[PDB]
Amino acid sequence: MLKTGVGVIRMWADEGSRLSRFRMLFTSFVEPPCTSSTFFCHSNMCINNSLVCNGVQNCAYPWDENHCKEKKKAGLFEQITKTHGTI
Amino acid sequence: LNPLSPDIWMYVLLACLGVSCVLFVIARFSPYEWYNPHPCNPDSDVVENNF
Ligand SMILES: CCCCCCCC/C=C\CCCCCCCC(=O)O[C@@H](COC(=O)CCCCCCCCCCCCCCC)COP(=O)([O-])OCC[N+](C)(C)C
Numbered sequence: 001m002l003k004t005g006v007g008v009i010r011m012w013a014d015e016g017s018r019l020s021r022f023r024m025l026f027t028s029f030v031e032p033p034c035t036s037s038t039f040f041c042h043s044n045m046c047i048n049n050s051l052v053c054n055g056v057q058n059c060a061y062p063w064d065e066n067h068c069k070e071k072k073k074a075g076l077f078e079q080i081t082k083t084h085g086t087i
Numbered sequence: 088l089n090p091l092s093p094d095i096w097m098y099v100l101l102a103c104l105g106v107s108c109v110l111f112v113i114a115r116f117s118p119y120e121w122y123n124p125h126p127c128n129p130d131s132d133v134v135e136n137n138f
């Protein structure tokens with residue numbers, strides 16, 4: 001967790017150690033008391049509300065990614081299809 | 088109402104409507120179900136069906 005808003009991530013690699021790879025995810029955040037256009041994860045996060053349901057973790061434990069799946073709840077109406085809704 | 092799935096509760100309820108229509112057709116079609124009522128007066132062509 002950096003202190004400024006600027007970081008200079010590098011990677012050194014020798015000719016032999018060329019296959020070495022990484023993949024990161026940098027996320028902007030502000031102080032605790034968030035507002036509109038900002039979602040609040042705890043421990044000093046004000047990630048953008050676009051980052052909620054982004055499909056990626058933009059925090060700690062996946063808090064931005066929850067209650068974001070809604071399909072259907074039914075009984076025999078769930079199976080009006082090639083299941084027993086034909087029979 | 089849970090120990091049978093809600094397609095079985097529909098298949099049972101369609102079976103009661105199924106078999107009772109099958110039983111009513113066969114009872115009117117079968118010539119042995121048409122018994123003769125009035126055993127006190129056993130001479131009349133008034134054979135009945137209770138189904
Ligand atoms: C006047 C006419 C009279 C007839 C109709 C009167 C109305 C009747 C009233 C109500 C209707 C009957 C019950 C309600 C609806 C059916 C429910 C059902 O699930 O289907 C059932 C039967 O249907 C089939 O799936 C076909 C199976 C082929 C063989 C069936 C024998 C019939 C032929 C007779 C052979 C001659 C025998 C002669 C003596 C030896 C079984 O379904 P399933 O396939 O097992 O399920 C798949 C299982 N799976 C999901 C795990 C894969």
Ligand SMILES: *[C@@H]1O[C@H](CO)[C@@H](O)[C@H](O)[C@H]1NC(C)=O
Pocket residue numbers: 037048049050
């Ligand atoms: C951050 O803010 C808005 C929410 O107001 C969000 O929808 C958008 O994707 C983001 N915009 C930028 C420029 O990062």
